[PDB]
Design a protein around this nucleic acid. Structure first.
Ligand SMILES: [Mg+2]
Ligand SMILES: [Mg+2]
Ligand SMILES: [Mg+2]
Ligand SMILES: [Mg+2]
Ligand SMILES: [Mg+2]
Ligand SMILES: [Mg+2]
Ligand SMILES: [Mg+2]
Ligand SMILES: [Mg+2]
Ligand SMILES: [Mg+2]
Ligand SMILES: [Mg+2]
Ligand SMILES: [Mg+2]
Ligand SMILES: [Mg+2]
Ligand SMILES: [Mg+2]
Ligand SMILES: [Mg+2]
Ligand SMILES: [Mg+2]
Ligand SMILES: [Mg+2]
Ligand SMILES: [Mg+2]
Ligand SMILES: [Mg+2]
Ligand SMILES: [Mg+2]
Ligand SMILES: [Mg+2]
Ligand SMILES: [Mg+2]
Ligand SMILES: [Mg+2]
Ligand SMILES: [Mg+2]
Ligand SMILES: [Mg+2]
Ligand SMILES: [Mg+2]
Ligand SMILES: [Mg+2]
Ligand SMILES: [Mg+2]
Ligand SMILES: [Mg+2]
Ligand SMILES: [Mg+2]
Ligand SMILES: [Mg+2]
Ligand SMILES: [Mg+2]
Ligand SMILES: [Mg+2]
Ligand SMILES: [Mg+2]
Ligand SMILES: [Mg+2]
Ligand SMILES: [Mg+2]
Ligand SMILES: [Mg+2]
Ligand SMILES: [Mg+2]
Ligand SMILES: [Mg+2]
Ligand SMILES: [Mg+2]
Ligand SMILES: [Mg+2]
Ligand SMILES: [Mg+2]
Ligand SMILES: [Mg+2]
Ligand SMILES: [Mg+2]
Ligand SMILES: [Mg+2]
Ligand SMILES: [Mg+2]
Ligand SMILES: [Mg+2]
Ligand SMILES: [Mg+2]
Ligand SMILES: [Mg+2]
Ligand SMILES: [Mg+2]
Lengths: 103, 30, 87, 55, 117, 251
RNA sequence: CUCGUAGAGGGGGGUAGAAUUCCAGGUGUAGCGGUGAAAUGCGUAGAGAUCUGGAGGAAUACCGGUGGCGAAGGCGGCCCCCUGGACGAAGACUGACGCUCAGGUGCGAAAGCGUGGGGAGCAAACAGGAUCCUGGUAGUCCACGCCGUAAACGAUGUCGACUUGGAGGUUGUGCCGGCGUGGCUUCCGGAGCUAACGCGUUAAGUCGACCGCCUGGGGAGUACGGCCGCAAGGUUAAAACUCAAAUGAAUUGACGCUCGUGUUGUGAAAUGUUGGGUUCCCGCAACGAGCGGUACAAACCGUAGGGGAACCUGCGGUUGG
């Protein structure tokens, strides 16, 4: 059970169901005895370079402390979800609860 | 950007560039 | 490597007390625990020749300690290899 | 210590084209230069900063 | 034929030839010219003067469109990069901006071995 | 590049051992440093050269004047079969040509169907060794197969670099090629044979089941008594002729 | 053993961006390409050029550094899983458990091979055009097996101790930018050492332990035999015969002029007469005097190939350029 920083962006046309996505991902966190330290939904942003003819993406910053197996399930469904077009899971040394520079 | 095309236009053996880098390093000592 | 809780458990069992960590039995037990754990790792990864160098160091070091323990006191040596299922 | 999510700080260490400025110009320490470079690479992946200006 | 009045000029300045192509914002070609198509061959084709008259031929070819403003994007490292720009500016076309579009790999493909002369 | 050592030239002429009554033709006399010692022992000596001033000099030579017949045309495009019937005898050739163009000329001479009695030439030691060497050796190659199919190769003398002026950095050797009166292993088409040799020796370190995979199958090779587990350099000239005949018959 | 630190350390799986090539479509229409100049080649069936879309393989610009990591060979996008080593602080604990190693075992660049995939670029060979150019097969890539060789080099075996010092990089940590205390690393240099070059606390200084290896050049790391390998070959390893040298380092010359003394160097020799300015001045280990790349006496290493071979080419490595 380690601390992992997870960032993923959602297709702008599907931004309405982003809160629905958050709960299901968080449900797997709480269900696996994991503690979600901080979450910061950045909403739509401007992409530096276009990807798949998209100029804006719904950035979601999530910091999670959870074991590896639940994270593996979390990353597998990211690849199988069409709403998210880019994902990044980063292991952190220590849990951090602080406001991001983006907010 | 013209200095990089001069380097990337023709392939250079990796041992060749390594010696030039060493030669440049010892040249800057004065 | 080996977990601190796993290391502490082995120290408590084989060692006389918690402070005692350098005893011959404790070191062999810690080495044996890591050696056995790595067996699953190297079975999956046959191309990791750099880590296998570290594994051989544990096996070679464990051999030296067992020889030293056997040369000094055979009684606790046999009592340890039978406890550890070695030799 | 550096954060890949701080776009304002990172852009101080990139050129107009997007290339990383060398440590010898800014005079930053070796340890933070590696952290800055790695942080910028993560920022490029998340489309926070561009790789080049020719996108 | 058609009236656009605004386009972007692509210049391919290699070490053997220079190509000037006039295209619109969408990227559809309108008229092109090359230094080698103007009677310059061998060493003469690789001269900046060959590109200088090549741009004028391209301006003559695209004069039907009545283009005023154009964007010059330099591609290739060979000589003649500046000569085409001067001719386009001296032909009456208004210079908007100049940018470099030389493709630079990020250590992608192995390049051909250097010729030994 | 020319030759200055006299005893080397004396050894060459003695090695050739010319006589009278039979036709001999020299390719590219040049300065005629070698044409002089052979123009005294022959009644009618023919030469082929591409220089006008040198030909005029040879025509005015006191010793080599009446004995010389100059041909001012390219030797590679020359038709050597006409001179054989013109003199009513097989030709004898002693080229001593530059190594750059000597190899194509030898194969050009091989194509006139044994119309030449003998061919003496100066080549590199490596080139000469390749012609002579048999299978199961590094020197053996596709040049060897196409060489000893037509003629028999016999090394005469290795020429040190000091003999030539200016002395080059590599050795030299004079070799005599004797075309076979009867082919020990005749073939139906040398183009097929050349195609096989250039196919096997392109990849001469792999087993012949891989280098000749696009032409022969495993059963075909075993059907001819050829082990597919042998390298190209292990295959004798006879087997190469055997495969060439088989390929022409079956394709 | 506890805490913590940095790192292209290793293995496996993903993903991103630039670029190359090809494919489809649109705009667009005569060249493109290449060279000293050309031609083969590519092109009215529509190229090159431009925009968009897709496929595919390989490699990771900048950062990047006489930077880092690894026993060596080697190791550079980002992310996750597994894993080795190192270092620092403060203790606890074991109580010589150590060092070095013939055989042995594993590891081991590039090239090469076996089986099956993959194949964009590059490219031995090959084919063609010229007097290098076009095209392009193996190969480079992947899985597994083999090969076990390099100028695999710091041409310096491993381990330990002791011995003047400066400047810098790189990672720790203690105290109040200063101030010490560690590890690795770069340059300069003292004694000392060395034939000289040079090395010089990371020794080629001063000693101890053990292992490997050499005793003229060529023949030759070749033959034979053994062992290993599918082969290429690798390893172990001569003799006959021949030459009286081969070689290292440094010096003096080639490609106005000397002496005396002194000084430097084991020495050949240099200094004087090496520099600045204008015969002259000044500086000056000199002071005064008399006068007017060389194999000379790019190269190489390992491997693979050659049918335009007076040698040349592909791959990696070395500076002994
Ligand atoms: Mg940390
Ligand atoms: Mg590329
Ligand atoms: Mg060879
Ligand atoms: Mg790594
Ligand atoms: Mg793998
Ligand atoms: Mg032609
Ligand atoms: Mg054609
Ligand atoms: Mg594909
Ligand atoms: Mg650089
Ligand atoms: Mg670099
Ligand atoms: Mg290190
Ligand atoms: Mg680690
Ligand atoms: Mg570790
Ligand atoms: Mg005790
Ligand atoms: Mg005690
Ligand atoms: Mg041994
Ligand atoms: Mg290996
Ligand atoms: Mg191996
Ligand atoms: Mg290989
Ligand atoms: Mg293979
Ligand atoms: Mg294959
Ligand atoms: Mg290929
Ligand atoms: Mg033709
Ligand atoms: Mg070529
Ligand atoms: Mg191909
Ligand atoms: Mg090509
Ligand atoms: Mg081919
Ligand atoms: Mg193949
Ligand atoms: Mg082996
Ligand atoms: Mg060796
Ligand atoms: Mg080296
Ligand atoms: Mg050695
Ligand atoms: Mg020491
Ligand atoms: Mg020093
Ligand atoms: Mg010594
Ligand atoms: Mg001897
Ligand atoms: Mg041998
Ligand atoms: Mg065997
Ligand atoms: Mg055998
Ligand atoms: Mg043998
Ligand atoms: Mg043997
Ligand atoms: Mg001296
Ligand atoms: Mg003295
Ligand atoms: Mg001395
Ligand atoms: Mg030199
Ligand atoms: Mg070689
Ligand atoms: Mg090379
Ligand atoms: Mg090396
Ligand atoms: Mg030597």
């Amino acid at each position: 059970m380690r601390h992992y920083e997870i960032v993923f962006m959602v297709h702008p046309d599907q931004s309405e169901q982003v809160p629905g996505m958050i709960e299901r991902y968080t449900a797997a966190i709480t269900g696996a005895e994991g503690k979600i330290h901080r979450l910061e939904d950045w909403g739509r942003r401007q992409l530096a370079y276009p990807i798949n003819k998209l100029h804006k993406a719904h950035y979601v910053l999530m910091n999670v402390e959870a074991p590896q197996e639940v994270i593996d399930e979390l990353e597998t469904t990211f690849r199988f979800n069409d709403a998210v077009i880019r994902s990044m899971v980063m292991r952190t040394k220590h849990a951090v609860t602080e406001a991001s520079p983006m907010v | 950007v013209l200095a990089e095309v001069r380097r990337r236009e023709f392939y250079e053996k990796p041992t060749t560039e390594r010696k030039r880098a060493k030669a440049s390093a010892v040249k800057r000592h004065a | 490597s080996l977990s601190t809780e796993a290391t502490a458990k082995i120290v408590s069992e084989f060692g006389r007390d918690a402070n005692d960590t350098g005893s011959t039995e404790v070191q062999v037990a810690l080495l044996t625990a890591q050696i056995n754990h790595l067996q699953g790792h190297f079975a999956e990864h046959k191309k990791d020749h750099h880590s296998r160098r570290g594994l051989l160091r544990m096996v070679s070091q464990r051999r030296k300690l067992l020889d030293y323990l056997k040369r000094k006191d055979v009684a606790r040596y046999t009592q340890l290899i039978e406890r550890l299922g070695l030799r | 210590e550096i954060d890949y999510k701080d776009i304002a700080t990172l852009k101080n260490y990139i050129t107009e084209s997007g290339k990383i400025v060398p440590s010898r110009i800014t005079g930053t320490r070796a340890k933070y230069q590696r952290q800055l470079a790695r942080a910028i690479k993560r920022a490029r992946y998340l489309s926070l900063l561009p790789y080049t200006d020719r996108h | 034929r058609k009236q656009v009045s605004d386009g972007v000029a692509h210049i391919h300045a290699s070490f053997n030839n220079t190509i000037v192509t006039i295209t619109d914002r969408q990227g559809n070609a309108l008229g092109w010219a090359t230094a080698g198509g103007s009677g310059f061959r061998g060493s003469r084709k690789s001269t900046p003067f060959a590109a200088q008259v090549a741009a004028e031929r391209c301006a003559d070819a695209v004069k039907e469109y009545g283009i005023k403003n154009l964007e010059v994007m330099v591609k290739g490292p060979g000589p003649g990069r500046e000569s085409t720009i001067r001719a386009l500016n001296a032909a009456g076309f208004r210079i908007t901006n100049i940018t470099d579009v030389t493709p630079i790999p990020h250590n992608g493909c192995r390049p051909p071995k250097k010729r030994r002369v | 590049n020319f030759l200055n050592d006299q005893f080397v030239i004396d050894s060459i002429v003695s090695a050739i051992n010319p006589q009278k009554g039979q036709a001999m033709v020299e390719i590219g006399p040049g300065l005629a440093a070698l044409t002089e010692p052979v123009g005294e022992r022959l009644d009618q000596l023919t030469v082929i050269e591409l220089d006008r001033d040198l030909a005029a000099r040879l025509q005015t030579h006191p010793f080599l004047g009446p004995k010389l017949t100059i041909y001012q045309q390219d030797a590679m495009t020359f038709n050597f079969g006409e001179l054989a019937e013109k003199m009513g005898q097989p030709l004898r050739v002693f080229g001593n040509l530059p190594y750059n163009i000597s190899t194509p000329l030898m194969f050009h001479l091989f194509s006139y169907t044994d119309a030449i009695a003998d061919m003496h030439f100066m080549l590199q030691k490596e080139v000469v060794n390749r012609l002579v060497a048999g299978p199961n050796s590094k020197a053996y190659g596709r040049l060897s197969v196409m060489a000893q199919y037509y003629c028999n190769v016999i090394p005469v003398l290795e020429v040190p670099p000091s003999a030539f002026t200016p002395p080059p950095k590599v050795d030299s050797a004079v070799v005599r090629l004797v075309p076979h009166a009867t082919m020990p292993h005749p073939v139906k088409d040398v183009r097929v044979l050349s195609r096989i040799t250039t196919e096997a020796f392109n990849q001469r370190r792999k087993t012949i089941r891989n280098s000749l995979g696009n032409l022969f199958s495993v059963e075909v090779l075993t059907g001819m008594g050829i082990d597919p587990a042998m390298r190209a350099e292990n295959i004798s000239v006879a087997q190469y002729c055997q495969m060439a005949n088989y390929l022409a018959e079956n394709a």
